[PDB]
Design a protein around this ligand. Structure first.
Ligand code: HEC
Ligand code: HEC
Ligand code: HEC
Ligand code: HEC
Ligand code: HEC
Ligand code: HEC
Ligand code: HEC
Ligand code: HEC
Ligand SMILES: [K+]
Lengths: 502, 57, 504, 503, 53, 55
């Protein structure tokens, strides 16, 4: 039993909450995790793309084989000693990490704010004993190279050409069952009432699957470009994107910067919106005054934190903190997704709003919190309506067949993509007049500018939904859409007059 | 099953009519016609939404 | 008397600064502050807009009513005890703040770099005695929840459903008379010789008034979008935008990040330009070497500051630091505003340029400072000239009525706005071909790119007035304006040739 | 001998490594440094532009003359005393600096990680003895105001109106011969196999020369705009852009922020790409765990640094660290430059690729480093192919003469610039339909979007070559080029159908 | 109300400070026939004076 | 001076830089008829070698 893992997760794994051992729960988790039907492997469109060099580090469970050159047979001590010359900083980073200083964790006295780590260590040891990798009274001495990269608690020899692996999520989940089960519970908690998104999405548990199930990603010839998408979509495969290798610092993963590399840009400017807001600017100003080493539960008390951070807001749910980040999602970044706006009034959304208010009321009053979140919802819908009116114009041109080069120069997208109007593929693939300018513009109006508007609203950045992002750019898009439509009408009217003379 | 489509303006007008009588007239949050913000009768928008909510389930 | 407060402020209040008591000064300040004719309330266009839920916090003196629940009567102690569970962090932030630890200010020694605070506490106490809020031998024990949110130095029971307020600028200015009067003096100091801007503007003193007196803000139906503008324009109403609630750290307000949320973006990228400059990059590198808790006048000595910050440059005037940020303004962000460019050579601006040089001489030589401010001035004019040439083209098309949809699809903006060419409304409202793309492009050329060019120039960010902002994007707008103008000329020339084929 | 300086520098200086004195090496450096033929002065287009007020600080050796007032004469002490209230912070920043606390550097212990500075002080003193500025037994007391602004180790009175100078690269080079020589060695090490760029470029050694040798910069009337470019191109002239005045902290120059003011923007978003990457975000998160005072050679060990920084990657070459940043350059930011893409497979680029692998292998494995550098190269090329296809369209239109206003409203660029297609001038100068919108669009597709795509790839920012920068923006330009192209073809087809009815 | 003067004319006025009416300066903004427009200082001072008066 | 080689030709050459002239690879850049263009390695290597010969 894990106290922070949802009931519907155990139900999905077909496990009893009171009669399930850490070994059985792990085995049920990995069985679903490594199953091609549940998202593992190359995906439905694997016959259209091949791995490049870096892909073995992006999807190790599918593509990774150990290197052939170092024909070596090594032991635990050999890993640290040889790689001190081969990858020095990797050794130095591991040396100062908690994984290598487990005795420090046992020396933690109960008046030290980091004391919870001792309980987590004992929890890790508990899990390993259940599986048979650790003796009942044997203490885990260290988490070294050979543990993650070969096998946990291994003392015998390892073939550098046969036994070396890239540590995936299940590898980390051997010791860290709680966090791995919390992460994998997103498959069961992120279920939309009307199938607005596929079951379990959006989530960190199925981010790679989403990536490889995107048609343009699989279809496009530019593998090196497409692999840029993969680098942001690796949380399914590896656990080192917030707390990185080889220090694996929890304090690091708690800082807003840890989410920035992926949660930024034209279609989700979360880093840009947050940092520019009072919440984020205060976080930048007071990062020295806070204790990041303290966990999220005690962040606002022992940590001294007086402004919210990405992890503090998104990992909190009904008073508890887990690696699950889905249970409060209502808008899911893209407000134009069918069913999302219609769902905003449902009891399902209202209960998730109540959970958000609970988060806000740690600092603000409920009246204040519910006031601004009312503004976030309506402002978002206000942005959506602006796009919907502009989309009605361009979509009417598509149905009439009047878009520039729609019948003269509109080549079909790469297999297995089907040609259509305002499809995602048109953002990463273009040839001739597929897409048209107006088509791309209204696509970017929703995908980029409407998304950023909502992100600005959700993360309290005034300029992020008015002047700079959101309303401002959407105003320009609407105007330019309307301008081109009127221009293409009076040109059609002129062309008809020329036809009236022939 | 799947939700029946409702435009954002109709979603705004519906939300604007929360805690209000069907005869109460509210301003649009999105629409401007003839140099003025379009006024909406709350009874009409609640009827518009209730019709769509029943056009799927 | 308050030494930092200008003479023109007392002249507007009809007060003799020599004999005028703190109570009289405060009363005359608030008298103007809460007066609709001087900017308070909903403004001239109030009948066109209504508050939303969050407006009760954005403009409390007009919209705030205490919550109906809980139906409870509370005392000073009760405020802290209950909200310790209800809004736990707000009590916690207040606890570790100065307002809750006034004894720590009395115990300040003469060798301590923060000793000036004890004199500020004594000045605050003297203000409250004059107003009758404090006894003559009574000392201010604390600044707690009941003080700001109900009444200063309250000793009796308070009703949560009737007596609670959102602390406005006059609420803070009850004790902090100096800073409140320093801020209000912007109404009197910021006066343009030829009426370039409304009197007292631009300023933090009238930022909300300016917001609600903007036609599109009152006219537009998207209230939640409109309130995003309001959130950047609340300095007039509340004093927690630089030094935030509930810690109210003065050190925090001195940091460049405190100004960033508002002074950033498409029409004034001050944060972007400053951070990317050497000044701002140094500030990010040296922030742990500086003492932020030290006051601004000792910042470069006792603090150890060697790179300038937003607060240090803009609050400084003639060697002294003051909540008035208006006294050195010459360009006022938007270089296209009529009169501004023509006023840059006046004695009024030249005197204010002397004041800026003074600010710069804290580090640079006068020669160096006058060399770069000459660049800022001429460069800003060079960017303005590029806009004016492009605007001539688009304006000609408006006069000729040849803009796309000008005669077929140009609906009127929402009331009480009136149709025009390249008006601010067209940035927050659009329907049909109002505005047209060319009209919007030239509007943004001035409003966004010319504005950012000056900011880049004013805040020493080279890429911010050349490649990335300013000259680059303006070049593009000029290029695209000229390109469309030619296209439409030869399209109408072709249209005329088709008309000749219809004479036959 | 300075072992960090390459052989070809001494060869170009016509000097023997082991025989040349510090005085001889300096003077030969300055001889090339101050020579108009080698890049100094106003350049080839000097008769087209005049200095502005700030130009005396941007290029002192050409433009600087001391101020007429104050008419004052002063000793070493009087420099500090008067400027203590005249320029208060300059004095304080100098007082905090190492240049004012030389005795503290002498008292440094051998086990201290900052001990190398004592060796550098004696290194400086050895240079000054050779040049006859310091006695054989005499030690340097301080590096003060009179030393850099008048003359090194002056012991008498100075005239504020005639003797005051702005400290250029040769001023700093008098003492810091190593770093001056290392920086000037870029002239000799940055030689492209097929002349892709001019010899010794791109580099900090010739950044001002490159600036003034750009036609628009000299040709455009907007001098104040033009000097904005100058402010990012002053490393040749002055040494205070990474380690600023008057603290002159080497620890400051090691911080990524020191490069940002120049290495950022639409045509090279290095700062944006690096900081948004894992490398750069970790540098933001862990900047207090790292000892920045530690030299770049020890940063990854004794400093505690676990993520790479601008300086660490670009100043490292084959296990060394020098003020030369040119010896691993293969793409040089702009991937569209003729010969660059074709050279990426040569032995020359492959050797520089191996040098890059060395830099990455300090942390990552060779298999990983080569895997990503391969992605970088192919991705950059995939970006170049997208641009090239778009350019083939717009270039065709120019040659056909069909661009908007090409034969109607295309005024000539200012002298001495010649008219052309998609020339750099059209980014900083425009009049009439010169350039046309399509022309400028494809110009910016190469200059801005393609360059930013490479930078994002080179600096490991996933969104910086996909959605936000590079591919995303290039997709839009391509679409808009193709859309306008078809529109103008349809317009031309309608043009011909009207002309037929008129015949 | 201050009389409207264009930015280019403001630059030309600045360029003619402490200069003779017969002196000729370059424009800061204008290019014609592939050359920076030269401006006689007597013309720009007269244009500014007639606006202020 | 090196003879001009297009970016797409550099990719196709790099994709073939290991294998046989009779082998077929996918393009990194080209899409025709709703499919990625298939490139014969003999065609691309000969195109590069006849360009390097012009030097
Ligand atoms: C793969 C599924 C993952 C494993 C296994 C672990 N992580 Fe994370 N992580 C993140 C945050 C914001 C925290 C702090 C949580 C809190 O304070 O309550 C953590 C913490 C951990 C810990 C505990 C370390 C400690 O001693 O406090 C473990 C054992 C752990 N994580 C393992 C952030 C993220 C994240 C970004 C969203 C991802 C994708 C993961 N963590 C993934 C895994
Ligand atoms: C000792 C001999 C020195 C040195 C090395 C410097 N000063 Fe001075 N200085 C003084 C004043 C009033 C100025 C400002 C002049 C102006 O802005 O017009 C300066 C300027 C400088 C500079 C910068 C020059 C420039 O071109 O910007 C420099 C590098 C400098 N000083 C160095 C005043 C005085 C004195 C009057 C009492 C004395 C004595 C000094 N300074 C001494 C020195
Ligand atoms: C068993 C041998 C482990 C494996 C495999 C991994 N980790 Fe671990 N880790 C382990 C223990 C016993 C502890 C101490 C208890 C605790 O939770 O702190 C840790 C520590 C961490 C931390 C916290 C470090 C800190 O900030 O002080 C993190 C963030 C962490 N571990 C993450 C992590 C990841 C991502 C792993 C997969 C590659 C991983 N660990 C493997 C034991 C073991
Ligand atoms: C518990 C019994 C309380 C005591 C004693 C006091 N307050 Fe309170 N307060 C309480 C609750 C449960 C709430 C939330 C109401 C909501 O719907 O959000 C509040 C709210 C406030 C607020 C903010 C009101 C708003 O408009 O958002 C303030 C400023 C406030 N409370 C202050 C305050 C003061 C000064 C008190 C002492 C006299 C006090 N509270 C007592 C619960 C309780
Ligand atoms: C009277 C009871 C007060 C009211 C109402 C407000 N403040 Fe205050 N504050 C008061 C005193 C006696 C002091 C200590 C003296 C000093 O000025 O330092 C303060 C402190 C501050 C500070 C400085 C805190 C620090 O950085 O150490 C700030 C920035 C401040 N006060 C601002 C402020 C604001 C915004 C208020 C309105 C909500 C406000 N104060 C109310 C007395 C009183
Ligand atoms: C770039 C793209 C891309 C390149 C082409 C591919 C294939 C993806 C795939 C997706 C999918 C699918 C979604 C929607 C979620 C789902 O389940 O179907 C999209 C989301 C996404 C997010 C979440 C945004 C939110 O909800 O706030 C984030 C953080 C993304 C970021 C990466 C990114 C890093 C900068 C890059 C590159 C891409 N994505 Fe994505 N992704 N993604 N993405
Ligand atoms: C967005 C807009 C907006 C939304 C619609 C409204 C109504 C305003 C109002 C104004 C006014 C008026 C001005 C000009 C000043 C005046 O008194 O007449 C404008 C100024 C402004 C600045 C000052 C720029 C300078 O001079 O340096 C700042 C910092 C503002 C920023 C906010 C902003 C936060 C990002 C948002 C949203 C808006 N404004 Fe404004 N405002 N504003 N503004
Ligand atoms: C803006 C421009 C500019 C203004 C009109 C001028 C004249 C220059 C000159 C150059 C040239 C030329 C080059 C190419 C290099 C060479 O020798 O011929 C260009 C490069 C350049 C870089 C290097 C980019 C890289 O990674 O290779 C950098 C850092 C800049 C920086 C400044 C700048 C940053 C905000 C501004 C202003 C300009 N440049 Fe430049 N320069 N430059 N530049
Ligand atoms: K810090």
């Amino acid at each position: 039993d894990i106290s922070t893992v949802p009931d519907e997760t155990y139900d999905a794994l077909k496990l009893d909450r009171g009669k399930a051992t850490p070994k059985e729960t792990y085995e049920a988790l990995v069985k679903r995790y490594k199953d091609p039907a549940h998202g593992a492997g190359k995906g439905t469109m694997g016959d259209y793309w091949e791995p490049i060099a870096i892909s073995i580090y992006m999807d190790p469970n599918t593509f990774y084989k150990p290197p052939v050159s170092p024909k070596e047979v090594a032991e635990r001590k050999d890993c640290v000693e040889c790689h001190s010359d081969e990858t020095p900083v990797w050794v130095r980073a591991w040396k100062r990490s908690t994984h290598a200083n487990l005795d420090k964790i046992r020396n933690l006295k109960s008046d030290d704010p980091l004391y919870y780590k001792k309980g987590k260590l004992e929890e890790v040891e508990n899990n390993l004993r259940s599986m048979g990798k650790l003796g009942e009274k044997e203490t885990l001495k260290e988490v070294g190279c050979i543990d993650c990269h070969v096998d946990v608690n291994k003392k015998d020899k390892a073939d550098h050409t046969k036994d070396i692996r890239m540590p995936t999520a299940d590898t980390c989940g051997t010791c860290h069952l709680r966090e791995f089960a919390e992460r994998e519970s997103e498959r069961d908690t992120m279920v939309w009432p009307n199938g607005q998104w596929p079951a379990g999405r959006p989530s960190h548990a199925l981010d790679y699957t989403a990536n490889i199930e995107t048609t343009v990603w699989a279809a496009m010839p530019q593998r090196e470009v497409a692999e840029g998408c993969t680098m942001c979509h690796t949380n399914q495969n590896k656990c080192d994107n917030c707390h990185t290798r080889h220090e694996f610092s929890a304090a690091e993963s708690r800082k807003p910067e840890a989410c920035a590399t992926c949660h930024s840009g034209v279609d989700h400017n979360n880093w840009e919106a947050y940092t520019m807001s009072k919440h984020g600017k205060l976080a930048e100003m007071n990062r020295d005054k806070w204790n990041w080493e303290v966990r999220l539960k005690d962040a606002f008390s022992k940590g001294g934190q007086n402004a919210p951070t990405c992890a503090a807001c998104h990992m909190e749910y009904e008073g508890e903190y887990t690696h699950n980040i889905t249970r409060k999602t209502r808008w899911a970044n893209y407000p134009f997704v069918p069913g999302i706006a219609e769902n905003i009034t449902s009891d399902w959304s209202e209960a998730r709003l109540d959970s958000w208010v609970l988060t806000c009321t740690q600092c603000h009053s409920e009246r204040f919190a519910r006031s601004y979140l009312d503004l976030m919802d309506k402002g978002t819908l206000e942005g959506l309506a602006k796009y919907q009116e502009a989309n009605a114009i361009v979509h009417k041109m598509y149905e009439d067949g009047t878009l520039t080069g729609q019948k003269t120069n509109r080549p079909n997208p790469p297999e297995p993509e089907k040609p259509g109007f305002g499809i995602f593929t048109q953002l990463f693939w273009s040839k001739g007049n597929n897409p048209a300018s107006l088509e791309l513009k209204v696509l970017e109006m929703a995908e980029n500018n409407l998304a950023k508007m909502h992100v600005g609203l959700a993360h309290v950045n005034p300029g992020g939904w008015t002047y700079t992002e959101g309303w401002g750019p959407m105003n320009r898009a609407y105007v330019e859409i309307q301008d081109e439509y009127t221009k293409m009408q009076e040109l059609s009217a002129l062309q008809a007059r020329v036809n009236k003379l022939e | 099953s799947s939700l029946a489509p409702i435009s954002a303006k109709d979603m705004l007008d519906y939300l604007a009519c929360k805690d209000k009588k069907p005869t109460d007239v509210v301003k649009s949050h999105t629409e401007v016609e003839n140099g003025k913000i379009v006024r909406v009768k709350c009874g009409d928008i609640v009827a518009l939404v209730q019709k769509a909510r029943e056009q799927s389930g």
